[model samples]
Target: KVFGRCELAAAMKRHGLDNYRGYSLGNWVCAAKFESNFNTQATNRNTDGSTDYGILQINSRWWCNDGRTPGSRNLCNIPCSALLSSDITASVNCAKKIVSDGNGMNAWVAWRNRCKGTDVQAWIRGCR
Candidate 1:
């Protein structure tokens, strides 16, 4: 629903998450690329029957309610669809809470496995 990466990065900065724990805007954008290809409507069904939602694929197992899902920690206290939109304010808030729980970006397996140590300069090459 957005044309380019600037919107995502600007919104992230607006949310005050830039350079959180040393993870730069580039890292966040890179991780989002891997997680959902920057498409807000993205959702992936997990083998555990949980689904991950939106740009960061926050999981329903502990973070949301997707209606079809039964029992969730719902720590983010949000409906999963809240994350599956171009308007990502709710998802960003939920993601913040996820990190606050102690894992930081480790809350995102995609971030951990793909971007944790990757050279991310290209992730923000022209957006600066």
Candidate 2:
């Protein structure tokens, strides 16, 4: 499912992503916008043979068990396929674990380059 701007914001908030750690809802909204354009089925394969999955682009290298990523930590302890579900519960849960694991939102290069240190609130301005 490709979520609309406000729809993704509302969904992320409902999943407990709002202010999860010190990051605001805007941060998540921006991240999703740049990461996967709110498309739950998005996937990106890295040159190193690891793949990123789902809306937040969770990586197979350390976050999920894709079986193809060498030495995967599977820190979220979930199959990579789960992240692709439109339900988003699994994707959001794994994202929370990613944040809690101390990687912060910097775990996503898109977030660091685009969302971080910007007026992210602009991404969710009309959503309120």
Q: Kindly report the root-mean-square deviation of model 1 from the true structure over all alpha carbons.
A: 1.6
RMSD of 2: 1.0
TM-score of structure candidate 2 = 0.95
User: Candidate 1: minimum summed lDDT over ten consecutive residues — where?
Assistant: 1-10
Q: Rate the local accuracy (lDDT) of all candidates.
A: 0.83, 0.92
Local accuracy of candidate 1 as per-residue lDDT tens digits, 1-128: 54267778888878876777667888888778889888888999998899999998999999998876677678888899989877888888887788778788988888889888888767777775
The candidate 2 region of ten consecutive residues with least summed lDDT is 119-128
Candidate 2 clash pair list: none
> What RMSD, rounded to one decimal, does every model reach?
1.6, 1.0
Model 1 TM-score, all chains together: 0.90
Q: Candidate 1 clashing pairs? A: none
Q: Score residue 126 of candidate 1 by CA lDDT.
A: 71
